[PDB]
């Protein structure tokens, strides 16, 4: 069937521009999003120590 | 012209904020009385040596004693 993605007209009123004005000017974007999704560093590194450890196979 | 501030602040929100800092910066030094306190201090900073003068008859004011109430009062700042 259908789906129309990335197809949405803007708000264009008094208050909702302040959500798009604080975004560009003071960067509430790009740090709450992209500075937190990188860190996300505390997870365990899933590395195989190849001369000692070995991975799975199949019969 | 009332939406002209609302069809450019939702269109190019960079230089709009510049003109607001172009404003509110020229006007206010002519407004608050905290200025001319800037002038009274910046003149009352002694760089050079205050050389005394010669008496002849008068004496309108200011005898030789420095700790006498003979000159002005800039000592409001220490009380400020």
From Swiss-Prot, chain A:
Q: Where in the cell is the protein located?
A: Mitochondrion inner membrane
| Oligomeric form and interacting partners | Core subunit of respiratory chain NADH dehydrogenase (Complex I) which is composed of 45 different subunits. This is a component of the iron-sulfur (IP) fragment of the enzyme. Interacts with RAB5IF.
Which family does the UniProt entry place this protein in?
Answer: Belongs to the complex I 23 kDa subunit family.
Main function: Core subunit of the mitochondrial membrane respiratory chain NADH dehydrogenase (Complex I) which catalyzes electron transfer from NADH through the respiratory chain, using ubiquinone as an electron acceptor. Essential for the catalytic activity and assembly of complex I.
Q: What is the official name of this protein in its record? A: NADH dehydrogenase [ubiquinone] iron-sulfur protein 8, mitochondrial
The source organism is: Bos taurus
User: Gene name, please?
Assistant: NDUFS8
Q: Which residues of the full protein are shown?
A: 37 to 95 of 212
Swiss-Prot record, chain B:
Keywords (A to Z) from UniProt? Acetylation, Electron transport, Membrane, Mitochondrion, Mitochondrion inner membrane, Respiratory chain, Transmembrane, Transmembrane helix, Transport
Membrane topology label:
Single-pass membrane protein
Q: Which residues cross the membrane?
A: 14-34
Q: Where is it localised?
A: Mitochondrion inner membrane
Query: Which Gene Ontology CC terms are recorded?
Result: mitochondrial inner membrane; mitochondrion; respiratory chain complex I
Region (Disordered), start-end ranges: 52-80
What Pfam families would the database entry show? NADHdh_A3
Coiled-coil segments: none
Does the record bear Membrane in its keywords? yes
* Quaternary structure (record): Complex I is composed of 45 different subunits.
Q: What role does it play?
A: Accessory subunit of the mitochondrial membrane respiratory chain NADH dehydrogenase (Complex I), that is believed not to be involved in catalysis. Complex I functions in the transfer of electrons from NADH to the respiratory chain. The immediate electron acceptor for the enzyme is believed to be ubiquinone.
Q: Which family does it belong to?
A: Belongs to the complex I NDUFA3 subunit family.
Q: What is this protein called?
A: NADH dehydrogenase [ubiquinone] 1 alpha subcomplex subunit 3
Primary gene name? NDUFA3
């Amino acid at each position: 069937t259908y789906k129309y993605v990335n197809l949405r007209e803007p708000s264009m009123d008094m208050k909702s521009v302040t959500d798009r004005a604080a975004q560009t000017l003071l960067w509430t974007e790009l740090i709450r999003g992209l500075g937190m999704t990188l860190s996300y560093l505390f997870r365990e590194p899933a590395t195989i120590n190849y001369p000692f450890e070995k991975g799975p196979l199949s019969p | 012209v009332a939406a002209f501030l609302k069809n450019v602040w939702a269109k190019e929100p960079v230089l709009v904020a510049s003109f607001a800092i172009a404003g509110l910066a020229v006007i206010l030094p002519t407004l608050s009385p905290y200025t001319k306190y800037s002038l009274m201090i910046n003149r009352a900073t002694p760089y050079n040596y205050p050389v005394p003068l010669r008496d002849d008859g008068n004496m309108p004011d200011v005898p030789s004693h420095p700790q006498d109430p003979q000159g002005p009062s800039l000592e409001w700042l220490k009380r400020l």
